[PDB]
Amino acid sequence: FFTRNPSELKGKFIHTKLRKSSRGFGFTVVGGDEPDEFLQIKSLVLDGPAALDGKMETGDVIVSVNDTCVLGHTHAQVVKIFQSIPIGASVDLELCRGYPLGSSAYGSVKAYTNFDAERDALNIETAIKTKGVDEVTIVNILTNRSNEQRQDIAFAYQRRTKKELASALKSALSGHLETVILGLLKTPAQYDASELKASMKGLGTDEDSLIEIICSRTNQELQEINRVYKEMYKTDLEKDIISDTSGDFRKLMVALAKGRRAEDGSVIDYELIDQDARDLYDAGVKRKGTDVPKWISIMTERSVPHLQKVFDRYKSYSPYDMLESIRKEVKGDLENAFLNLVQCIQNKPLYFADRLYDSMKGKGTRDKVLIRIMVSRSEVDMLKIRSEFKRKYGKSLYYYIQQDTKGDYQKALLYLCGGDD
Ligand SMILES: [Ca+2]
Ligand SMILES: [Ca+2]
Ligand SMILES: [Ca+2]
Ligand SMILES: [Ca+2]
Ligand SMILES: [Ca+2]
């Protein structure tokens, strides 16, 4: 939720007067790198003038600066205002509290307010070394902390025990719960890199997990994954993909994995929307055979909002929509990859909602899929996933998880889910 009107903000307003000392006002701001996005306080230097006042907290939307509304201004416009203020002069800030964090706006797992990594690390150490292992405690803590907070916890645990938290939980847990907790302990890029590597272990590759991750991750996420993957495994992700795929499926996975998709522009390119749509039709349903490189080129290179509009314009040219045309034109891992891809383009939360439903709908559970989605999307779009799940399937994601999993494993997944619908 965003609004550049002070008359449409619902939270409480806070007026504050700050004098810029030698180390700045003493706070970090986040947001504003988008068209419509707020500007919220990230951290406060506990020895700076911002924390001295004590009336500014993390998550406060900056409504105005020096009698000028900064709601809707970019990140560089309001940073230049505070930096132009010399040392010793005053600034006036009207803030707004009641909004989350912008980044984790649609996640189910939020940063824990009264966070204390040392107290958490001790409590996890005490749970581990309790006779029979206190898994409930380990679960209650790690699933109600942000990934950032789980990194501080593992650092404090390592400082206290001289042992790695991940090693200790490995030896204390087992089964699906172990998979969940260890997954949560990795950073988003670390987790995705290790899931990618596992999908390519052995001679046979897990094309479903490879497709799910490569097709759903953004440019920014794929950039970091490529970086951390070479760090962890001493090889480029691209090479491992080249080694474990072939044909047009390899072409599509390599192109997507680069994370070089064009960024969403400011202008809608209507001529290109129509031309791209025409090109997708001519390359497939219109003709005998398929020009797959043309599909690959358009679907990996255009920005997502652009491709959403070409898929709608594509319906003007083809009697089948993009998904139907994929099933008609192409088969195998290539068909699966294209289907996963344009689902992620069209409605990514619905894509994950359907993947979750498929993992539980029948006999047993595809736990690797369920666990990976619950872990990797809990701080991204889990609230949207739950809204699409409930709308389409008529019962909550929570309800399905509860039916399909049991034990502390279930409790961990339910916490990552964040509640019923
Ligand atoms: Ca136990
Ligand atoms: Ca074990
Ligand atoms: Ca393999
Ligand atoms: Ca055909
Ligand atoms: Ca089931």
From Swiss-Prot:
GO terms for biological process: angiogenesis; cell-matrix adhesion; collagen fibril organization; epithelial cell apoptotic process; fibrinolysis; lung development; membrane raft assembly; mRNA transcription by RNA polymerase II. There is a cross-link at K131 (Glycyl lysine isopeptide (Lys-Gly) (interchain with G-Cter in SUMO2)). The keyword Secreted applies. Keywords: Acetylation, Annexin, Basement membrane, Calcium, Calcium/phospholipid-binding, Extracellular matrix, Host-virus interaction, Isopeptide bond, Phosphoprotein, Repeat, RNA-binding, Secreted, Ubl conjugation. It is found in: Secreted, Extracellular space, Extracellular matrix, Basement membrane; Melanosome. SUPFAM superfamilies: Annexin. Phosphorylation of Tyr-106 enhances heat stress-induced translocation to the cell surface. Its main location: secreted. The keyword Calcium applies. One of its GO terms (cellular component) is early endosome. Changing V180L: Does not affect interaction with PCSK9. There is a cross-link at K131 (Glycyl lysine isopeptide (Lys-Gly) (interchain with G-Cter in SUMO1)). GO terms for molecular function: cadherin binding involved in cell-cell adhesion; calcium ion binding; calcium-dependent phospholipid binding; calcium-dependent protein binding; cytoskeletal protein binding; identical protein binding; phosphatidylinositol-4,5-bisphosphate binding; phosphatidylserine binding. Transmembrane segments: none annotated. The modification Phosphotyrosine is found at Y106, Y281. It may cross-link plasma membrane phospholipids with actin and the cytoskeleton and be involved with exocytosis. Heterotetramer containing 2 light chains of S100A10/p11 and 2 heavy chains of ANXA2/p36. Interacts with ATP1B1. Interacts with DYSF. Interacts with COCH. Interacts (via repeat Annexin 1) with PCSK9 (via the C-terminal domain); the interaction inhibits the degradation of LDLR. Interacts with CEACAM1 (via the cytoplasmic domain); this interaction is regulated by phosphorylation of CEACAM1. Interacts with APPL2 and APPL1; targets APPL2 to endosomes and acting in parallel to RAB5A. Interacts with S100A4. May interact with UBAP2. It is linked to Increased expression of ANXA2 is associated with hepatocellular carcinoma tumor progression. Belongs to the annexin family. Calcium-regulated membrane-binding protein whose affinity for calcium is greatly enhanced by anionic phospholipids. It binds two calcium ions with high affinity. May be involved in heat-stress response. Inhibits PCSK9-enhanced LDLR degradation, probably reduces PCSK9 protein levels via a translational mechanism but also competes with LDLR for binding with PCSK9. Binds to endosomes damaged by phagocytosis of particulate wear debris and participates in endosomal membrane stabilization, thereby limiting NLRP3 inflammasome activation. A pair of annexin repeats may form one binding site for calcium and phospholipid. This is Annexin A2. It comes from Homo sapiens. The gene is ANXA2.
